[PDB]
Amino acid sequence: GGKVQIINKKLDLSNVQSKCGSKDNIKHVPGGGSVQIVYKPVDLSKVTSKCGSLGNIHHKPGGGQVEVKSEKLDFKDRVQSKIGSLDNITHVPGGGNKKIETHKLTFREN
Amino acid sequence: GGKVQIINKKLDLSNVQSKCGSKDNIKHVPGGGSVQIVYKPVDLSKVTSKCGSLGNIHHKPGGGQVEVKSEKLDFKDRVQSKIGSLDNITHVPGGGNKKIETHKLTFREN
Amino acid sequence: GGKVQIINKKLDLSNVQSKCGSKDNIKHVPGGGSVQIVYKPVDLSKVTSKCGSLGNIHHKPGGGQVEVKSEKLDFKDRVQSKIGSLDNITHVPGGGNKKIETHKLTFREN
Amino acid sequence: GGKVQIINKKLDLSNVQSKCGSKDNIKHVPGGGSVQIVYKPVDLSKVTSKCGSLGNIHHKPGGGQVEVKSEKLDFKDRVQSKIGSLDNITHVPGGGNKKIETHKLTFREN
Amino acid sequence: GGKVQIINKKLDLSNVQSKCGSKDNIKHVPGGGSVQIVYKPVDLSKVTSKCGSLGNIHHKPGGGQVEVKSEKLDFKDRVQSKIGSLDNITHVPGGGNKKIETHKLTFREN
Protein backbone atom coordinates (compact mmCIF):
# COMPACT_ATOMS: atom_id res chain seq x y z
CA GLY A 1 0.00 0.00 0.00
CA GLY A 2 0.86 3.68 0.12
CA LYS A 3 1.91 5.22 3.43
CA VAL A 4 1.21 8.94 3.93
CA GLN A 5 3.14 10.55 6.79
CA ILE A 6 2.96 14.23 7.76
CA ILE A 7 4.94 15.94 10.52
CA ASN A 8 4.18 19.51 11.58
CA LYS A 9 6.07 21.32 14.34
CA LYS A 10 6.10 24.97 15.44
CA LEU A 11 3.97 26.21 12.56
CA ASP A 12 2.04 29.48 12.44
CA LEU A 13 -0.97 29.66 10.12
CA SER A 14 -3.06 32.81 9.65
CA ASN A 15 -5.90 33.50 7.22
CA VAL A 16 -7.55 36.93 7.29
CA GLN A 17 -10.54 37.84 5.11
CA SER A 18 -11.95 41.35 5.47
CA LYS A 19 -14.75 43.15 3.62
CA CYS A 20 -14.83 40.58 0.80
CA GLY A 21 -17.85 39.82 -1.37
CA SER A 22 -20.13 42.52 0.01
CA LYS A 23 -22.94 43.95 -2.12
CA ASP A 24 -23.73 47.62 -1.52
CA ASN A 25 -26.02 50.11 -3.28
CA ILE A 26 -27.67 47.93 -5.93
CA LYS A 27 -30.88 49.09 -7.62
CA HIS A 28 -33.06 46.82 -9.77
CA VAL A 29 -35.64 48.87 -11.67
CA PRO A 30 -37.18 46.83 -14.51
CA GLY A 31 -40.37 47.91 -16.20
CA GLY A 32 -40.81 51.23 -17.96
CA GLY A 33 -44.12 50.33 -19.57
CA SER A 34 -42.90 47.28 -21.49
CA VAL A 35 -45.01 44.22 -22.36
CA GLN A 36 -42.96 41.14 -21.40
CA ILE A 37 -39.89 41.30 -19.15
CA VAL A 38 -38.09 38.16 -17.98
CA TYR A 39 -35.75 39.42 -15.26
CA LYS A 40 -33.39 36.65 -14.11
CA PRO A 41 -29.91 37.98 -13.28
CA VAL A 42 -27.72 35.20 -11.90
CA ASP A 43 -24.76 35.62 -9.54
CA LEU A 44 -22.11 32.92 -8.98
CA SER A 45 -19.29 35.09 -7.61
CA LYS A 46 -16.95 33.02 -5.39
CA VAL A 47 -14.49 34.88 -3.08
CA THR A 48 -12.38 32.20 -1.41
CA SER A 49 -9.44 32.52 0.97
CA LYS A 50 -7.42 29.66 2.42
CA CYS A 51 -4.15 29.05 4.25
CA GLY A 52 -2.36 25.77 4.93
CA SER A 53 -5.04 23.35 3.77
CA LEU A 54 -4.77 19.84 2.33
CA GLY A 55 -6.95 17.70 0.10
CA ASN A 56 -8.42 14.23 0.40
CA ILE A 57 -6.34 11.13 1.11
CA HIS A 58 -8.05 8.11 -0.45
CA HIS A 59 -6.79 4.58 -1.07
CA LYS A 60 -8.01 2.95 -4.30
CA PRO A 61 -11.01 5.29 -4.87
CA GLY A 62 -12.49 3.43 -7.81
CA GLY A 63 -16.06 2.68 -8.84
CA GLY A 64 -19.07 4.82 -9.63
CA GLN A 65 -18.84 8.51 -8.74
CA VAL A 66 -16.32 9.28 -5.99
CA GLU A 67 -15.71 12.84 -4.72
CA VAL A 68 -17.73 14.20 -7.65
CA LYS A 69 -19.07 17.75 -7.34
CA SER A 70 -21.76 18.53 -9.93
CA GLU A 71 -23.53 21.85 -10.50
CA LYS A 72 -26.29 22.31 -13.08
CA LEU A 73 -28.25 25.49 -13.79
CA ASP A 74 -31.25 25.34 -16.13
CA PHE A 75 -32.51 28.74 -17.28
CA LYS A 76 -34.26 27.85 -20.54
CA ASP A 77 -36.91 30.48 -21.24
CA ARG A 78 -39.83 30.35 -23.73
CA VAL A 79 -41.31 33.85 -24.30
CA GLN A 80 -44.21 34.35 -26.72
CA SER A 81 -45.98 37.58 -27.62
CA LYS A 82 -48.92 38.27 -29.92
CA ILE A 83 -50.02 41.87 -30.49
CA GLY A 84 -52.64 42.90 -33.03
CA SER A 85 -51.49 46.52 -33.10
CA LEU A 86 -49.06 48.53 -30.95
CA ASP A 87 -49.05 52.33 -31.12
CA ASN A 88 -46.84 54.78 -29.22
CA ILE A 89 -48.36 58.17 -30.08
CA THR A 90 -47.29 61.62 -28.86
CA HIS A 91 -50.04 63.85 -30.28
CA VAL A 92 -49.54 67.49 -29.28
CA PRO A 93 -51.78 69.76 -31.39
CA GLY A 94 -52.85 73.32 -30.65
CA GLY A 95 -50.56 75.90 -29.14
CA GLY A 96 -49.29 76.85 -25.70
CA ASN A 97 -46.41 76.20 -23.29
CA LYS A 98 -46.16 72.41 -23.49
CA LYS A 99 -43.30 70.20 -22.31
CA ILE A 100 -43.82 66.45 -22.74
CA GLU A 101 -41.23 63.98 -21.43
CA THR A 102 -41.63 60.28 -22.19
CA HIS A 103 -39.23 57.52 -21.11
CA LYS A 104 -36.68 60.10 -19.94
CA LEU A 105 -33.86 58.59 -17.87
CA THR A 106 -31.34 60.74 -16.01
CA PHE A 107 -28.19 59.61 -14.19
CA ARG A 108 -26.24 62.21 -12.18
CA GLU A 109 -23.31 60.63 -10.35
CA ASN A 110 -21.82 63.92 -9.08
CA GLY B 1 -3.39 -1.24 3.21
CA GLY B 2 -2.49 2.43 3.36
CA LYS B 3 -1.41 3.93 6.68
CA VAL B 4 -2.06 7.64 7.21
CA GLN B 5 -0.11 9.20 10.08
CA ILE B 6 -0.25 12.88 11.09
CA ILE B 7 1.75 14.54 13.87
CA ASN B 8 1.04 18.11 14.96
CA LYS B 9 2.95 19.87 17.73
CA LYS B 10 3.03 23.52 18.86
CA LEU B 11 0.91 24.80 16.00
CA ASP B 12 -0.99 28.10 15.92
CA LEU B 13 -4.01 28.33 13.61
CA SER B 14 -6.06 31.50 13.17
CA ASN B 15 -8.90 32.25 10.76
CA VAL B 16 -10.51 35.70 10.87
CA GLN B 17 -13.49 36.66 8.70
CA SER B 18 -14.87 40.18 9.09
CA LYS B 19 -17.65 42.03 7.27
CA CYS B 20 -17.77 39.48 4.43
CA GLY B 21 -20.80 38.78 2.26
CA SER B 22 -23.05 41.49 3.67
CA LYS B 23 -25.85 42.98 1.56
CA ASP B 24 -26.59 46.65 2.19
CA ASN B 25 -28.86 49.18 0.46
CA ILE B 26 -30.54 47.04 -2.20
CA LYS B 27 -33.74 48.25 -3.87
CA HIS B 28 -35.96 46.02 -6.03
CA VAL B 29 -38.52 48.12 -7.91
CA PRO B 30 -40.09 46.12 -10.76
CA GLY B 31 -43.27 47.25 -12.43
CA GLY B 32 -43.68 50.59 -14.16
CA GLY B 33 -47.01 49.75 -15.77
CA SER B 34 -45.83 46.70 -17.72
CA VAL B 35 -47.97 43.67 -18.61
CA GLN B 36 -45.95 40.56 -17.68
CA ILE B 37 -42.87 40.67 -15.45
CA VAL B 38 -41.11 37.50 -14.31
CA TYR B 39 -38.74 38.70 -11.58
CA LYS B 40 -36.41 35.89 -10.47
CA PRO B 41 -32.92 37.18 -9.64
CA VAL B 42 -30.75 34.37 -8.29
CA ASP B 43 -27.78 34.73 -5.93
CA LEU B 44 -25.16 31.99 -5.40
CA SER B 45 -22.32 34.13 -4.02
CA LYS B 46 -19.98 32.01 -1.82
CA VAL B 47 -17.50 33.82 0.49
CA THR B 48 -15.42 31.10 2.13
CA SER B 49 -12.46 31.37 4.50
CA LYS B 50 -10.47 28.47 5.93
CA CYS B 51 -7.21 27.80 7.74
CA GLY B 52 -5.45 24.51 8.38
CA SER B 53 -8.16 22.12 7.21
CA LEU B 54 -7.93 18.63 5.73
CA GLY B 55 -10.14 16.53 3.49
CA ASN B 56 -11.65 13.07 3.76
CA ILE B 57 -9.60 9.94 4.44
CA HIS B 58 -11.35 6.95 2.86
CA HIS B 59 -10.13 3.41 2.20
CA LYS B 60 -11.38 1.83 -1.04
CA PRO B 61 -14.35 4.21 -1.58
CA GLY B 62 -15.87 2.39 -4.53
CA GLY B 63 -19.45 1.70 -5.56
CA GLY B 64 -22.43 3.88 -6.32
CA GLN B 65 -22.16 7.55 -5.40
CA VAL B 66 -19.62 8.27 -2.64
CA GLU B 67 -18.97 11.81 -1.35
CA VAL B 68 -20.98 13.22 -4.26
CA LYS B 69 -22.28 16.78 -3.91
CA SER B 70 -24.97 17.61 -6.49
CA GLU B 71 -26.71 20.96 -7.02
CA LYS B 72 -29.46 21.47 -9.59
CA LEU B 73 -31.39 24.68 -10.26
CA ASP B 74 -34.40 24.58 -12.60
CA PHE B 75 -35.63 28.01 -13.71
CA LYS B 76 -37.39 27.17 -16.97
CA ASP B 77 -40.02 29.84 -17.64
CA ARG B 78 -42.94 29.76 -20.13
CA VAL B 79 -44.39 33.28 -20.66
CA GLN B 80 -47.29 33.83 -23.06
CA SER B 81 -49.03 37.10 -23.93
CA LYS B 82 -51.97 37.83 -26.22
CA ILE B 83 -53.03 41.45 -26.74
CA GLY B 84 -55.64 42.53 -29.27
CA SER B 85 -54.45 46.15 -29.31
CA LEU B 86 -52.00 48.10 -27.15
CA ASP B 87 -51.95 51.91 -27.28
CA ASN B 88 -49.70 54.32 -25.37
CA ILE B 89 -51.18 57.73 -26.19
CA THR B 90 -50.08 61.15 -24.95
CA HIS B 91 -52.81 63.43 -26.33
CA VAL B 92 -52.26 67.05 -25.30
CA PRO B 93 -54.49 69.37 -27.38
CA GLY B 94 -55.52 72.93 -26.61
CA GLY B 95 -53.19 75.47 -25.08
CA GLY B 96 -51.90 76.38 -21.64
CA ASN B 97 -49.02 75.67 -19.24
CA LYS B 98 -48.81 71.88 -19.48
CA LYS B 99 -45.97 69.63 -18.33
CA ILE B 100 -46.54 65.88 -18.80
CA GLU B 101 -43.97 63.38 -17.51
CA THR B 102 -44.41 59.69 -18.31
CA HIS B 103 -42.04 56.90 -17.25
CA LYS B 104 -39.46 59.44 -16.07
CA LEU B 105 -36.65 57.88 -14.02
CA THR B 106 -34.10 59.99 -12.15
CA PHE B 107 -30.96 58.80 -10.35
CA ARG B 108 -28.98 61.36 -8.32
CA GLU B 109 -26.06 59.73 -6.52
CA ASN B 110 -24.53 62.99 -5.22
CA GLY C 1 3.40 1.26 -3.20
CA GLY C 2 4.22 4.96 -3.11
CA LYS C 3 5.24 6.54 0.19
CA VAL C 4 4.50 10.25 0.64
CA GLN C 5 6.40 11.91 3.49
CA ILE C 6 6.17 15.60 4.43
CA ILE C 7 8.13 17.36 7.18
CA ASN C 8 7.33 20.94 8.20
CA LYS C 9 9.19 22.78 10.95
CA LYS C 10 9.17 26.45 12.02
CA LEU C 11 7.04 27.64 9.12
CA ASP C 12 5.08 30.89 8.96
CA LEU C 13 2.06 31.01 6.64
CA SER C 14 -0.06 34.13 6.13
CA ASN C 15 -2.90 34.77 3.68
CA VAL C 16 -4.59 38.18 3.72
CA GLN C 17 -7.58 39.03 1.52
CA SER C 18 -9.03 42.52 1.84
CA LYS C 19 -11.85 44.27 -0.04
CA CYS C 20 -11.89 41.68 -2.82
CA GLY C 21 -14.89 40.86 -5.00
CA SER C 22 -17.21 43.56 -3.65
CA LYS C 23 -20.03 44.93 -5.81
CA ASP C 24 -20.86 48.60 -5.24
CA ASN C 25 -23.17 51.05 -7.03
CA ILE C 26 -24.79 48.82 -9.66
CA LYS C 27 -28.01 49.93 -11.38
CA HIS C 28 -30.16 47.61 -13.50
CA VAL C 29 -32.75 49.61 -15.43
CA PRO C 30 -34.26 47.53 -18.26
CA GLY C 31 -37.46 48.55 -19.97
CA GLY C 32 -37.94 51.85 -21.76
CA GLY C 33 -41.23 50.91 -23.37
CA SER C 34 -39.98 47.85 -25.25
CA VAL C 35 -42.05 44.75 -26.10
CA GLN C 36 -39.96 41.71 -25.10
CA ILE C 37 -36.90 41.93 -22.85
CA VAL C 38 -35.07 38.82 -21.65
CA TYR C 39 -32.75 40.13 -18.93
CA LYS C 40 -30.36 37.39 -17.75
CA PRO C 41 -26.91 38.77 -16.92
CA VAL C 42 -24.68 36.04 -15.51
CA ASP C 43 -21.73 36.51 -13.14
CA LEU C 44 -19.05 33.84 -12.55
CA SER C 45 -16.27 36.06 -11.19
CA LYS C 46 -13.90 34.04 -8.95
CA VAL C 47 -11.48 35.95 -6.66
CA THR C 48 -9.34 33.31 -4.95
CA SER C 49 -6.41 33.68 -2.57
CA LYS C 50 -4.36 30.86 -1.08
CA CYS C 51 -1.09 30.30 0.76
CA GLY C 52 0.74 27.06 1.48
CA SER C 53 -1.92 24.59 0.33
CA LEU C 54 -1.60 21.07 -1.08
CA GLY C 55 -3.75 18.88 -3.29
CA ASN C 56 -5.18 15.40 -2.96
CA ILE C 57 -3.07 12.33 -2.22
CA HIS C 58 -4.75 9.27 -3.74
CA HIS C 59 -3.44 5.75 -4.33
CA LYS C 60 -4.64 4.08 -7.55
CA PRO C 61 -7.65 6.38 -8.15
CA GLY C 62 -9.11 4.48 -11.07
CA GLY C 63 -12.67 3.68 -12.10
CA GLY C 64 -15.70 5.78 -12.92
CA GLN C 65 -15.52 9.47 -12.07
CA VAL C 66 -13.01 10.30 -9.32
CA GLU C 67 -12.44 13.88 -8.08
CA VAL C 68 -14.47 15.19 -11.03
CA LYS C 69 -15.85 18.72 -10.76
CA SER C 70 -18.54 19.45 -13.36
CA GLU C 71 -20.35 22.74 -13.97
CA LYS C 72 -23.10 23.15 -16.56
CA LEU C 73 -25.10 26.30 -17.30
CA ASP C 74 -28.09 26.09 -19.65
CA PHE C 75 -29.39 29.47 -20.84
CA LYS C 76 -31.11 28.52 -24.09
CA ASP C 77 -33.80 31.12 -24.83
CA ARG C 78 -36.70 30.93 -27.32
CA VAL C 79 -38.22 34.41 -27.93
CA GLN C 80 -41.13 34.85 -30.36
CA SER C 81 -42.93 38.06 -31.29
CA LYS C 82 -45.87 38.69 -33.61
CA ILE C 83 -47.01 42.27 -34.21
CA GLY C 84 -49.63 43.25 -36.77
CA SER C 85 -48.52 46.88 -36.88
CA LEU C 86 -46.12 48.93 -34.74
CA ASP C 87 -46.16 52.74 -34.95
CA ASN C 88 -43.98 55.23 -33.06
CA ILE C 89 -45.53 58.59 -33.96
CA THR C 90 -44.51 62.06 -32.78
CA HIS C 91 -47.28 64.25 -34.22
CA VAL C 92 -46.82 67.90 -33.25
CA PRO C 93 -49.08 70.13 -35.39
CA GLY C 94 -50.20 73.68 -34.69
CA GLY C 95 -47.94 76.30 -33.20
CA GLY C 96 -46.68 77.31 -29.76
CA ASN C 97 -43.80 76.71 -27.34
CA LYS C 98 -43.51 72.92 -27.50
CA LYS C 99 -40.63 70.75 -26.30
CA ILE C 100 -41.11 66.99 -26.70
CA GLU C 101 -38.49 64.57 -25.35
CA THR C 102 -38.85 60.85 -26.08
CA HIS C 103 -36.42 58.14 -24.96
CA LYS C 104 -33.91 60.75 -23.82
CA LEU C 105 -31.07 59.30 -21.72
CA THR C 106 -28.58 61.49 -19.87
CA PHE C 107 -25.42 60.41 -18.03
CA ARG C 108 -23.51 63.05 -16.05
CA GLU C 109 -20.56 61.52 -14.20
CA ASN C 110 -19.12 64.84 -12.95
CA GLY D 1 6.80 2.53 -6.41
CA GLY D 2 7.57 6.23 -6.35
CA LYS D 3 8.57 7.85 -3.07
CA VAL D 4 7.78 11.56 -2.65
CA GLN D 5 9.66 13.27 0.19
CA ILE D 6 9.38 16.96 1.09
CA ILE D 7 11.31 18.77 3.84
CA ASN D 8 10.46 22.34 4.83
CA LYS D 9 12.29 24.24 7.56
CA LYS D 10 12.23 27.91 8.60
CA LEU D 11 10.09 29.05 5.68
CA ASP D 12 8.09 32.27 5.49
CA LEU D 13 5.08 32.34 3.15
CA SER D 14 2.93 35.43 2.61
CA ASN D 15 0.08 36.01 0.15
CA VAL D 16 -1.65 39.40 0.15
CA GLN D 17 -4.64 40.20 -2.07
CA SER D 18 -6.13 43.68 -1.78
CA LYS D 19 -8.96 45.38 -3.68
CA CYS D 20 -8.97 42.76 -6.45
CA GLY D 21 -11.95 41.89 -8.62
CA SER D 22 -14.31 44.57 -7.31
CA LYS D 23 -17.14 45.89 -9.48
CA ASP D 24 -18.01 49.55 -8.95
CA ASN D 25 -20.34 51.95 -10.77
CA ILE D 26 -21.93 49.68 -13.39
CA LYS D 27 -25.16 50.74 -15.12
CA HIS D 28 -27.27 48.38 -17.23
CA VAL D 29 -29.88 50.33 -19.18
CA PRO D 30 -31.36 48.20 -22.00
CA GLY D 31 -34.56 49.18 -23.72
CA GLY D 32 -35.08 52.45 -25.55
CA GLY D 33 -38.35 51.45 -27.16
CA SER D 34 -37.06 48.40 -29.01
CA VAL D 35 -39.09 45.27 -29.84
CA GLN D 36 -36.97 42.26 -28.81
CA ILE D 37 -33.92 42.53 -26.55
CA VAL D 38 -32.06 39.46 -25.31
CA TYR D 39 -29.76 40.82 -22.59
CA LYS D 40 -27.34 38.12 -21.39
CA PRO D 41 -23.90 39.55 -20.56
CA VAL D 42 -21.65 36.85 -19.12
CA ASP D 43 -18.71 37.38 -16.75
CA LEU D 44 -16.01 34.75 -16.12
CA SER D 45 -13.25 37.02 -14.78
CA LYS D 46 -10.87 35.04 -12.51
CA VAL D 47 -8.48 37.00 -10.22
CA THR D 48 -6.31 34.40 -8.49
CA SER D 49 -3.39 34.83 -6.10
CA LYS D 50 -1.31 32.05 -4.58
CA CYS D 51 1.96 31.54 -2.73
CA GLY D 52 3.82 28.33 -1.98
CA SER D 53 1.20 25.81 -3.11
CA LEU D 54 1.56 22.29 -4.48
CA GLY D 55 -0.56 20.06 -6.68
CA ASN D 56 -1.95 16.56 -6.33
CA ILE D 57 0.20 13.52 -5.55
CA HIS D 58 -1.44 10.43 -7.05
CA HIS D 59 -0.09 6.92 -7.61
CA LYS D 60 -1.26 5.21 -10.81
CA PRO D 61 -4.30 7.47 -11.44
CA GLY D 62 -5.73 5.52 -14.35
CA GLY D 63 -9.27 4.67 -15.39
CA GLY D 64 -12.33 6.73 -16.23
CA GLN D 65 -12.18 10.43 -15.41
CA VAL D 66 -9.70 11.32 -12.66
CA GLU D 67 -9.17 14.90 -11.46
CA VAL D 68 -11.21 16.17 -14.42
CA LYS D 69 -12.63 19.69 -14.18
CA SER D 70 -15.33 20.36 -16.80
CA GLU D 71 -17.17 23.63 -17.44
CA LYS D 72 -19.92 23.97 -20.05
CA LEU D 73 -21.95 27.10 -20.82
CA ASP D 74 -24.93 26.83 -23.18
CA PHE D 75 -26.27 30.19 -24.40
CA LYS D 76 -27.97 29.19 -27.65
CA ASP D 77 -30.68 31.75 -28.42
CA ARG D 78 -33.58 31.50 -30.92
CA VAL D 79 -35.13 34.95 -31.57
CA GLN D 80 -38.03 35.34 -34.00
CA SER D 81 -39.87 38.52 -34.97
CA LYS D 82 -42.82 39.09 -37.31
CA ILE D 83 -44.00 42.66 -37.94
CA GLY D 84 -46.62 43.58 -40.52
CA SER D 85 -45.55 47.23 -40.66
CA LEU D 86 -43.19 49.32 -38.53
CA ASP D 87 -43.26 53.12 -38.77
CA ASN D 88 -41.12 55.66 -36.90
CA ILE D 89 -42.71 58.99 -37.83
CA THR D 90 -41.73 62.49 -36.68
CA HIS D 91 -44.52 64.63 -38.15
CA VAL D 92 -44.11 68.30 -37.21
CA PRO D 93 -46.39 70.47 -39.38
CA GLY D 94 -47.55 74.02 -38.72
CA GLY D 95 -45.33 76.68 -37.23
CA GLY D 96 -44.10 77.73 -33.81
CA ASN D 97 -41.21 77.19 -31.37
CA LYS D 98 -40.88 73.40 -31.50
CA LYS D 99 -37.97 71.28 -30.27
CA ILE D 100 -38.40 67.51 -30.63
CA GLU D 101 -35.76 65.13 -29.25
CA THR D 102 -36.08 61.40 -29.95
CA HIS D 103 -33.62 58.73 -28.80
CA LYS D 104 -31.14 61.38 -27.67
CA LEU D 105 -28.30 59.98 -25.56
CA THR D 106 -25.84 62.22 -23.72
CA PHE D 107 -22.67 61.19 -21.86
CA ARG D 108 -20.80 63.87 -19.90
CA GLU D 109 -17.84 62.40 -18.02
CA ASN D 110 -16.44 65.74 -16.80
CA GLY E 1 10.19 3.81 -9.64
CA GLY E 2 10.92 7.52 -9.61
CA LYS E 3 11.88 9.18 -6.34
CA VAL E 4 11.06 12.88 -5.95
CA GLN E 5 12.90 14.64 -3.12
CA ILE E 6 12.58 18.33 -2.25
CA ILE E 7 14.47 20.19 0.48
CA ASN E 8 13.58 23.76 1.44
CA LYS E 9 15.37 25.70 4.16
CA LYS E 10 15.27 29.38 5.17
CA LEU E 11 13.13 30.47 2.23
CA ASP E 12 11.09 33.67 2.01
CA LEU E 13 8.09 33.68 -0.34
CA SER E 14 5.90 36.73 -0.91
CA ASN E 15 3.06 37.26 -3.39
CA VAL E 16 1.29 40.64 -3.42
CA GLN E 17 -1.71 41.38 -5.66
CA SER E 18 -3.24 44.84 -5.41
CA LYS E 19 -6.09 46.49 -7.33
CA CYS E 20 -6.05 43.84 -10.07
CA GLY E 21 -9.02 42.92 -12.25
CA SER E 22 -11.41 45.58 -10.97
CA LYS E 23 -14.25 46.85 -13.16
CA ASP E 24 -15.17 50.51 -12.67
CA ASN E 25 -17.52 52.87 -14.52
CA ILE E 26 -19.07 50.56 -17.12
CA LYS E 27 -22.30 51.56 -18.87
CA HIS E 28 -24.39 49.16 -20.97
CA VAL E 29 -27.01 51.06 -22.95
CA PRO E 30 -28.45 48.89 -25.75
CA GLY E 31 -31.66 49.81 -27.49
CA GLY E 32 -32.21 53.07 -29.34
CA GLY E 33 -35.47 52.01 -30.96
CA SER E 34 -34.13 48.96 -32.78
CA VAL E 35 -36.12 45.80 -33.59
CA GLN E 36 -33.97 42.83 -32.52
CA ILE E 37 -30.93 43.15 -30.26
CA VAL E 38 -29.03 40.11 -28.99
CA TYR E 39 -26.76 41.52 -26.28
CA LYS E 40 -24.32 38.86 -25.04
CA PRO E 41 -20.90 40.34 -24.22
CA VAL E 42 -18.62 37.68 -22.74
CA ASP E 43 -15.70 38.27 -20.36
CA LEU E 44 -12.96 35.67 -19.71
CA SER E 45 -10.24 37.98 -18.37
CA LYS E 46 -7.84 36.06 -16.07
CA VAL E 47 -5.48 38.07 -13.80
CA THR E 48 -3.29 35.50 -12.04
CA SER E 49 -0.38 35.99 -9.64
CA LYS E 50 1.72 33.24 -8.09
CA CYS E 51 4.99 32.79 -6.22
CA GLY E 52 6.89 29.61 -5.44
CA SER E 53 4.30 27.05 -6.56
CA LEU E 54 4.71 23.53 -7.90
CA GLY E 55 2.63 21.25 -10.09
CA ASN E 56 1.27 17.74 -9.71
CA ILE E 57 3.46 14.73 -8.89
CA HIS E 58 1.86 11.61 -10.38
CA HIS E 59 3.26 8.11 -10.90
CA LYS E 60 2.12 6.36 -14.09
CA PRO E 61 -0.95 8.57 -14.75
CA GLY E 62 -2.34 6.58 -17.65
CA GLY E 63 -5.87 5.69 -18.69
CA GLY E 64 -8.95 7.69 -19.56
CA GLN E 65 -8.85 11.41 -18.77
CA VAL E 66 -6.39 12.35 -16.02
CA GLU E 67 -5.91 15.95 -14.85
CA VAL E 68 -7.95 17.16 -17.83
CA LYS E 69 -9.41 20.67 -17.62
CA SER E 70 -12.11 21.29 -20.26
CA GLU E 71 -13.99 24.52 -20.93
CA LYS E 72 -16.73 24.82 -23.55
CA LEU E 73 -18.79 27.91 -24.36
CA ASP E 74 -21.77 27.59 -26.73
CA PHE E 75 -23.14 30.92 -27.98
CA LYS E 76 -24.82 29.87 -31.23
CA ASP E 77 -27.56 32.39 -32.02
CA ARG E 78 -30.44 32.09 -34.53
CA VAL E 79 -32.04 35.52 -35.22
CA GLN E 80 -34.93 35.85 -37.66
CA SER E 81 -36.80 39.00 -38.67
CA LYS E 82 -39.75 39.52 -41.02
CA ILE E 83 -40.97 43.06 -41.69
CA GLY E 84 -43.59 43.93 -44.28
CA SER E 85 -42.57 47.59 -44.44
CA LEU E 86 -40.23 49.73 -42.33
CA ASP E 87 -40.35 53.53 -42.60
CA ASN E 88 -38.25 56.11 -40.75
CA ILE E 89 -39.87 59.41 -41.71
CA THR E 90 -38.94 62.93 -40.58
CA HIS E 91 -41.75 65.02 -42.08
CA VAL E 92 -41.38 68.70 -41.18
CA PRO E 93 -43.69 70.83 -43.37
CA GLY E 94 -44.89 74.37 -42.74
CA GLY E 95 -42.70 77.07 -41.27
CA GLY E 96 -41.50 78.16 -37.85
CA ASN E 97 -38.62 77.68 -35.40
CA LYS E 98 -38.24 73.90 -35.49
CA LYS E 99 -35.31 71.81 -34.24
CA ILE E 100 -35.70 68.04 -34.57
CA GLU E 101 -33.03 65.70 -33.16
CA THR E 102 -33.30 61.96 -33.83
CA HIS E 103 -30.81 59.33 -32.65
CA LYS E 104 -28.37 62.02 -31.53
CA LEU E 105 -25.52 60.67 -29.40
CA THR E 106 -23.09 62.96 -27.57
CA PHE E 107 -19.92 61.98 -25.70
CA ARG E 108 -18.08 64.70 -23.74
CA GLU E 109 -15.11 63.28 -21.85
CA ASN E 110 -13.76 66.65 -20.65
Swiss-Prot record, chains A, B, C, D, E:
Its PTM note reads: Phosphorylation at serine and threonine residues in S-P or T-P motifs by proline-directed protein kinases (PDPK1, CDK1, CDK5, GSK3, MAPK) (only 2-3 sites per protein in interphase, seven-fold increase in mitosis, and in the form associated with paired helical filaments (PHF-tau)), and at serine residues in K-X-G-S motifs by MAP/microtubule affinity-regulating kinase (MARK1, MARK2, MARK3 or MARK4), causing detachment from microtubules, and their disassembly. Phosphorylation decreases with age. Polyubiquitinated. Requires functional TRAF6 and may provoke SQSTM1-dependent degradation by the proteasome. PHF-tau can be modified by three different forms of polyubiquitination. 'Lys-48'-linked polyubiquitination is the major form, 'Lys-6'-linked and 'Lys-11'-linked polyubiquitination also occur.
Which parts are the Tau/MAP repeats? 4-34, 35-65, 66-97
Expressed, tissue-wise, as follows:
Expressed in neurons. Isoform PNS-tau is expressed in the peripheral nervous system while the others are expressed in the central nervous system.
- Name positions with the PTM N6,N6-dimethyllysine: 40
Which positions carry Phosphoserine?
14, 22, 34, 53, 81, 85
- Effect on the protein of changing residue 30 to S: In FTD1 and CBD; reduction in the ability to promote microtubule assembly
> Which residues carry the post-translational modification Deamidated asparagine, per the record?
8
Query: Which function does this protein serve?
Result: Promotes microtubule assembly and stability, and might be involved in the establishment and maintenance of neuronal polarity. The C-terminus binds axonal microtubules while the N-terminus binds neural plasma membrane components, suggesting that tau functions as a linker protein between both. Axonal polarity is predetermined by TAU/MAPT localization (in the neuronal cell) in the domain of the cell body defined by the centrosome. The short isoforms allow plasticity of the cytoskeleton whereas the longer isoforms may preferentially play a role in its stabilization.
Q: How does it assemble?
A: Interacts with MARK1, MARK2, MARK3 and MARK4. Interacts with PSMC2 through SQSTM1. Interacts with SQSTM1 when polyubiquitinated. Interacts with FKBP4. Binds to CSNK1D. Interacts with SGK1. Interacts with PIN1. Interacts with LRRK2. Interacts with LRP1, leading to endocytosis; this interaction is reduced in the presence of LRPAP1/RAP.
Annotated spans, Microtubule-binding domain: 1-97
Would you say which domain of life the source belongs to?
A: Eukaryota
Q: Where in the cell is it found?
A: Cytoplasm, Cytosol; Cell membrane; Cytoplasm, Cytoskeleton; Cell projection, Axon
The residues joined by the cross-link Glycyl lysine isopeptide (Lys-Gly) (interchain with G-Cter in ubiquitin) are 10, 27, 40, 46, 50, 60, 72, 76, 82, 98, 104
Q: What is the effect of changing residue 25 to H?
A: In FTD1; reduced the ability of tau to promote microtubule assembly without having a significant effect on tau filament formation; effects at both the RNA and the protein level
Q: For the modification Omega-N-methylarginine, which residues carry it?
A: 78
The illness linked here is:
In Alzheimer disease, the neuronal cytoskeleton in the brain is progressively disrupted and replaced by tangles of paired helical filaments (PHF) and straight filaments, mainly composed of hyperphosphorylated forms of TAU (PHF-TAU or AD P-TAU). O-GlcNAcylation is greatly reduced in Alzheimer disease brain cerebral cortex leading to an increase in TAU/MAPT phosphorylations.
Record remark: domains: The tau/MAP repeat binds to tubulin. Type I isoforms contain 3 repeats while type II isoforms contain 4 repeats.
Identify this protein by name. Microtubule-associated protein tau
Enumerate the transmembrane spans. Answer: none
Could you say what the effect of mutating residue 34 to N is?
In FTD1; minimal parkinsonism; very early age of onset
Q: Which residues carry this modification: N6-acetyllysine?
A: 10, 19, 27, 40, 46, 50, 60, 72, 76, 98
Q: Which residues are glycosylated?
A: 9-10, 76, 82, 98
Q: Which cysteines link up through disulfide bonds?
A: 20-51
Site for Not glycated, residues: 3, 19, 23, 27, 40, 46, 50, 60, 69, 72, 99, 104
